Amino acid sequence: ATAAQAERTLPKKYGGRFTVTLIPGDGVGKEITDSVRTIFEAENIPIDWETINIKEGVYEAVESLKRNKIGLKGLWHTPADQTGHGSLNVALRKQLDIYANVALFKSLKGVKTRIPDIDLIVIRENTEGEFSGLEHESVPGVVESLKVMTRPKTERIARFAFDFAKKYNRKSVTAVHKANIMKLGDGLFRNIITEIGQKEYPDIDVSSIIVDNASMQAVAKPHQFDVLVTPSMYGTILGNIGAALIGGPGLVAGANFGRDYAVFEPGSRHVGLDIKGQNVANPTAMILSSTLMLNHLGLNEYATRISKAVHETIAEGKHTTRDIGGSSSTTDFTNEIINKLSTM
Amino acid sequence: YGGRFTVTLIPGDGVGKEITDSVRTIFEAENIPIDWETINIKEGVYEAVESLKRNKIGLKGLWHTPADQTGHGSLNVALRKQLDIYANVALFKSLKGVKTRIPDIDLIVIRENTEGEFSGLEHESVPGVVESLKVMTRPKTERIARFAFDFAKKYNRKSVTAVHKANIMKLGDGLFRNIITEIGQKEYPDIDVSSIIVDNASMQAVAKPHQFDVLVTPSMYGTILGNIGAALIGGPGLVAGANFGRDYAVFEPGSRHVGLDIKGQNVANPTAMILSSTLMLNHLGLNEYATRISKAVHETIAEGKHTTRDIGGSSSTTDFTNEIINKLSTM
Amino acid sequence: ATAAQAERTLPKKYGGRFTVTLIPGDGVGKEITDSVRTIFEAENIPIDWETINIKEGVYEAVESLKRNKIGLKGLWHTPADQTGHGSLNVALRKQLDIYANVALFKSLKGVKTRIPDIDLIVIRENTEGEFSGLEHESVPGVVESLKVMTRPKTERIARFAFDFAKKYNRKSVTAVHKANIMKLGDGLFRNIITEIGQKEYPDIDVSSIIVDNASMQAVAKPHQFDVLVTPSMYGTILGNIGAALIGGPGLVAGANFGRDYAVFEPGSRHVGLDIKGQNVANPTAMILSSTLMLNHLGLNEYATRISKAVHETIAEGKHTTRDIGGSSSTTDFTNEIINKLSTM
């Protein structure tokens, strides 16, 4: 007999103060996270960071998130060499079965973009597909990479997508696939999605689109899309199209969901290795997905707040950071937010 | 910063009313952006609860509890049980300007508030035969166990020890000792988990206290080790305390004595109240203030005379407060 | 992965043949079970008995049922002395969390009863209440028996009862209690039942009745009752009232349900120690609850069948067994069933 005190599946909390996991990670990670810290204590938000740093201590990230249930992170770096270690961004997700990635591509007022007024969401599956990481070399020079697609993992993401679309009043959900060629793999994906968007979630418009043609429409006529559901790879691709469409990787909020845990990271997924320590970086991405996390753990008075802050800051011409067309540093941009914030 | 916060104030019985006031004065003299919603009371312990449910945070003294048969019952525990503020933290750290028999002592006692021998279930079967039922449950126990470790991790405490009597109450205290050590091994592996039998713990505490770091106990053993610790460092007037639930937090003295006998005499020592008052600031994020006004009282009492009666001084609550506000006005 | 091949949770079955557990148990148990065996192979029913016999090997009964999921049993005997072992009828149920007992009190055509045309069901909770078996002697001569009642176990039986009433088109469900005296214990029981018969199962008539007054109506005016839900003790009491009302313990079908397992036994719960080996016993009880088991594991063409057999047999005067008013032996009664059956 165990209900009211079974809370032990909820986000670490004591006397109102959450304990959230913080994983700065590589590249502009460390700076872009700090921006959030500063805006957080300057707004005196009741959360305490348990913050971790790292080769295989990706264990300690997992173990932490398992205690706290909630996390805020940047991106880790990834070797391309043969004796390199392997994502460990995916490791984190796979080990926590945080199977759903949401990226938010909504254009911002003070930013010059080639096609304006754009609002689309890309939900991708995190643990499966071409990210299954099964590969072998039969004879020298011949390599097979196995791409797994399973009904259970696919029904899961399918429902998450529709549930998400319902919750945030999204009218259309489109499955991106290559089912005309990989008739079993992507086929299964396209069916299961359209199949369970018809017998459940009948209020929502379900459709399919072939990944290559999807890529073309996305670049040429993006307004026709609302929500896109994709397997691991197509989501990286459509993701980056969307990232560009709205200004760049610095403006994209992101979040990852499992059944028990939730980890919030930038929606664009770029490390910024080249500009590490230069204080040139743009924290809009990190902050905005940071607000997504507040809405999640129920705060969101703060979230509604500090999002308007950054939204207005960047719409308001100069004082904005390098990549948007300004000349301010990460430091300066942060402080304009905390400033605008101090007068609300 | 910018904005105001509304904290609950429950002065309570005994030196409560004076010891709270000390904090009020130090607070407005430091112009701290908090407004007290202050309540006074037989069964309006309801209004305390209802208040804390709105404000989420509170600062309180102790209420008095009868020992007679038709007396009302703690209602210090009632407050906690009704808010499920299940975790009590008491901080026994010796202070510079205070003569103690064993010096340089720093230990913490975390006790469970809602269960154990404080479950208040008892009956008289036939006349002259009384049974008091002591409840111990896995859920409430896993909860406190994690709170303790989480706490130890957060405040860089290396050792956590479970106090029990599991050799005799093999199911009750047994369950407690297991669940603690059990989940200090598969989670929180960085921390040193151990057990100690309550009676032997009591002996070490009095004779060789430095061997302890953090102690986790059920309701009763915490009252006992608590008072050992209280004595060890000077007295009930030097001990900061706090109570935690998932949603609420109520800060009170860590020693838990009413001081009924010296009510209204202005002889009382507010170190306890103030220091746990600083705990509350750190909590609601202020803590520039906290870091501040703690150094104030710490230095004040280290600095010989002008300190209050029980520490070895001759000053009144009033005078001690003003030395703090004075030292504070020069920072 | 999972779904199709999985199903390690249905009843043991190999190429069309169920493997059911058989626990003859004490008293007329051994004879009354045999009656069923004979009628079963004479009807060539595709089930194979795994049959067990036994002081603490009540373990082996549990372990068996955990494999097969389904069982058919008589009653074991229980000591009244102080160093006696303890029910182990309840042990079986508690260890399998077969928490729901159903007894079927429906009068039979060829049987003289004081009040005729009677059809009521008694559902009792098996694992809790006064069957919780917690007791201690504080000082010599003073004994406390603790009676546990918990919301979870109670919500469970409450829904089982309503679900059952809905499934078998029963219109009324009544909670038997002593809530006027044991305001917490039986109080909780009465509330939880009526409470969740109002916000779920609104089509069914929920009501309460005090156990003593229930006992009086049951004996004097039983037709007013439809389904009765009770804690462990009141169910033993109302049970035996119902048993008498319809003829005796030999006419009552019974079944026990848990979430995963199901054990079928006589609904009246008497061992018949005194007439063991005399071949005088009446197997109607055993057989009828045996038919309940068939309906369960889906057979039930057989069940519908072999129930009509025994129903007609006993309605048809002589050739019926001793306790109903006949002069036939268990053996003879069985063979009349198998005979009537051979001509259907």
PDB file of N, CA, C and O in Angstrom, chain B residues 14 29 32 34 52 81 92 94 112 149 171 173 175 199 201 213 219 238 245-246 263 272 290 304 316 331:
ATOM      1  N   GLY B  14       6.385  29.739  24.508  1.00  0.00           N
ATOM      2  CA  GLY B  14       7.654  29.980  25.167  1.00  0.00           C
ATOM      3  C   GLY B  14       8.402  31.153  24.575  1.00  0.00           C
ATOM      4  O   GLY B  14       7.805  32.092  24.033  1.00  0.00           O
ATOM      5  N   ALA B  29      15.960  45.556   9.344  1.00  0.00           N
ATOM      6  CA  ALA B  29      17.186  46.337   9.475  1.00  0.00           C
ATOM      7  C   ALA B  29      18.178  46.023   8.347  1.00  0.00           C
ATOM      8  O   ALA B  29      19.140  46.752   8.121  1.00  0.00           O
ATOM      9  N   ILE B  32      15.374  43.084   4.023  1.00  0.00           N
ATOM     10  CA  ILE B  32      15.170  41.868   3.249  1.00  0.00           C
ATOM     11  C   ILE B  32      13.745  41.837   2.707  1.00  0.00           C
ATOM     12  O   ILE B  32      12.784  42.026   3.445  1.00  0.00           O
ATOM     13  N   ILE B  34      11.215  40.251   2.239  1.00  0.00           N
ATOM     14  CA  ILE B  34      10.183  39.278   2.602  1.00  0.00           C
ATOM     15  C   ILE B  34       9.141  39.858   3.574  1.00  0.00           C
ATOM     16  O   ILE B  34       9.471  40.638   4.469  1.00  0.00           O
ATOM     17  N   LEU B  52       0.784  27.842   5.197  1.00  0.00           N
ATOM     18  CA  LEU B  52       1.943  27.216   4.577  1.00  0.00           C
ATOM     19  C   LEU B  52       1.627  26.618   3.224  1.00  0.00           C
ATOM     20  O   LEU B  52       2.476  26.565   2.365  1.00  0.00           O
ATOM     21  N   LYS B  81       2.970  16.327   9.841  1.00  0.00           N
ATOM     22  CA  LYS B  81       2.230  15.228   9.254  1.00  0.00           C
ATOM     23  C   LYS B  81       1.223  15.710   8.217  1.00  0.00           C
ATOM     24  O   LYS B  81       1.085  15.110   7.155  1.00  0.00           O
ATOM     25  N   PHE B  92      24.449  20.586  14.116  1.00  0.00           N
ATOM     26  CA  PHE B  92      25.255  20.699  15.314  1.00  0.00           C
ATOM     27  C   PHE B  92      26.689  20.982  14.932  1.00  0.00           C
ATOM     28  O   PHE B  92      27.484  20.067  14.727  1.00  0.00           O
ATOM     29  N   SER B  94      29.856  23.455  16.292  1.00  0.00           N
ATOM     30  CA  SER B  94      30.263  24.285  17.415  1.00  0.00           C
ATOM     31  C   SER B  94      30.648  25.671  16.939  1.00  0.00           C
ATOM     32  O   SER B  94      30.987  25.864  15.773  1.00  0.00           O
ATOM     33  N   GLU B 112      13.266  11.169  10.408  1.00  0.00           N
ATOM     34  CA  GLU B 112      11.967  11.084   9.774  1.00  0.00           C
ATOM     35  C   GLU B 112      10.911  11.621  10.749  1.00  0.00           C
ATOM     36  O   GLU B 112      10.927  11.297  11.933  1.00  0.00           O
ATOM     37  N   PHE B 149      20.845  11.041   1.680  1.00  0.00           N
ATOM     38  CA  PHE B 149      21.969  10.930   0.766  1.00  0.00           C
ATOM     39  C   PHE B 149      22.063  12.139  -0.145  1.00  0.00           C
ATOM     40  O   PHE B 149      23.115  12.749  -0.251  1.00  0.00           O
ATOM     41  N   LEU B 171      12.020  -6.508  12.547  1.00  0.00           N
ATOM     42  CA  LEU B 171      11.233  -6.099  11.397  1.00  0.00           C
ATOM     43  C   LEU B 171      11.203  -4.589  11.241  1.00  0.00           C
ATOM     44  O   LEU B 171      11.513  -4.076  10.174  1.00  0.00           O
ATOM     45  N   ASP B 173      12.934  -1.727  12.871  1.00  0.00           N
ATOM     46  CA  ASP B 173      14.190  -1.034  12.677  1.00  0.00           C
ATOM     47  C   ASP B 173      15.033  -1.775  11.650  1.00  0.00           C
ATOM     48  O   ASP B 173      15.891  -1.187  10.985  1.00  0.00           O
ATOM     49  N   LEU B 175      13.964  -3.144   8.783  1.00  0.00           N
ATOM     50  CA  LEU B 175      13.558  -2.579   7.505  1.00  0.00           C
ATOM     51  C   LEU B 175      14.228  -1.243   7.262  1.00  0.00           C
ATOM     52  O   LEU B 175      14.704  -0.973   6.172  1.00  0.00           O
ATOM     53  N   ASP B 199      21.704   2.709  21.060  1.00  0.00           N
ATOM     54  CA  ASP B 199      22.296   2.867  22.387  1.00  0.00           C
ATOM     55  C   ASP B 199      23.808   3.087  22.320  1.00  0.00           C
ATOM     56  O   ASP B 199      24.351   3.973  22.980  1.00  0.00           O
ATOM     57  N   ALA B 201      25.341   4.180  19.698  1.00  0.00           N
ATOM     58  CA  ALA B 201      25.489   5.452  19.028  1.00  0.00           C
ATOM     59  C   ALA B 201      25.482   6.552  20.057  1.00  0.00           C
ATOM     60  O   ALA B 201      26.301   7.458  19.997  1.00  0.00           O
ATOM     61  N   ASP B 213      29.346  11.929  10.980  1.00  0.00           N
ATOM     62  CA  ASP B 213      29.215  12.942   9.933  1.00  0.00           C
ATOM     63  C   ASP B 213      27.737  13.285   9.740  1.00  0.00           C
ATOM     64  O   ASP B 213      27.278  14.365  10.118  1.00  0.00           O
ATOM     65  N   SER B 219      11.932   8.762  13.979  1.00  0.00           N
ATOM     66  CA  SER B 219      11.496   9.846  14.852  1.00  0.00           C
ATOM     67  C   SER B 219      12.142   9.906  16.247  1.00  0.00           C
ATOM     68  O   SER B 219      12.597  10.975  16.667  1.00  0.00           O
ATOM     69  N   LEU B 238      21.821  27.323  20.047  1.00  0.00           N
ATOM     70  CA  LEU B 238      22.827  27.486  19.008  1.00  0.00           C
ATOM     71  C   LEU B 238      22.554  26.609  17.786  1.00  0.00           C
ATOM     72  O   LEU B 238      23.354  26.574  16.845  1.00  0.00           O
ATOM     73  N   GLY B 245       9.473  18.880   3.118  1.00  0.00           N
ATOM     74  CA  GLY B 245       8.588  17.957   2.436  1.00  0.00           C
ATOM     75  C   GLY B 245       8.857  18.145   0.962  1.00  0.00           C
ATOM     76  O   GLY B 245       9.771  18.868   0.592  1.00  0.00           O
ATOM     77  N   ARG B 246       8.077  17.525   0.099  1.00  0.00           N
ATOM     78  CA  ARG B 246       8.340  17.703  -1.323  1.00  0.00           C
ATOM     79  C   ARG B 246       7.953  19.103  -1.797  1.00  0.00           C
ATOM     80  O   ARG B 246       8.684  19.729  -2.558  1.00  0.00           O
ATOM     81  N   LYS B 263       9.850  32.822  29.526  1.00  0.00           N
ATOM     82  CA  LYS B 263       9.029  33.577  28.587  1.00  0.00           C
ATOM     83  C   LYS B 263       8.842  34.999  29.069  1.00  0.00           C
ATOM     84  O   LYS B 263       8.451  35.225  30.210  1.00  0.00           O
ATOM     85  N   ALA B 272      19.834  30.265  17.630  1.00  0.00           N
ATOM     86  CA  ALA B 272      19.097  29.173  17.011  1.00  0.00           C
ATOM     87  C   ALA B 272      18.184  29.715  15.933  1.00  0.00           C
ATOM     88  O   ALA B 272      18.373  29.438  14.755  1.00  0.00           O
ATOM     89  N   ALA B 290      21.934  35.812   3.608  1.00  0.00           N
ATOM     90  CA  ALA B 290      22.203  34.713   4.526  1.00  0.00           C
ATOM     91  C   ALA B 290      23.681  34.651   4.883  1.00  0.00           C
ATOM     92  O   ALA B 290      24.045  34.689   6.065  1.00  0.00           O
ATOM     93  N   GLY B 304      33.700  37.654  22.502  1.00  0.00           N
ATOM     94  CA  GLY B 304      33.375  37.703  23.920  1.00  0.00           C
ATOM     95  C   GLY B 304      32.072  38.376  24.319  1.00  0.00           C
ATOM     96  O   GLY B 304      31.021  38.143  23.725  1.00  0.00           O
ATOM     97  N   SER B 316      21.062  40.746  27.105  1.00  0.00           N
ATOM     98  CA  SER B 316      19.706  40.263  26.886  1.00  0.00           C
ATOM     99  C   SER B 316      19.462  40.012  25.405  1.00  0.00           C
ATOM    100  O   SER B 316      20.228  40.462  24.560  1.00  0.00           O
ATOM    101  N   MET B 331      29.235  46.491   6.792  1.00  0.00           N
ATOM    102  CA  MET B 331      29.757  45.453   5.894  1.00  0.00           C
ATOM    103  C   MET B 331      29.822  45.830   4.403  1.00  0.00           C
ATOM    104  O   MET B 331      30.763  45.440   3.695  1.00  0.00           O
TER     105      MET B 331
END
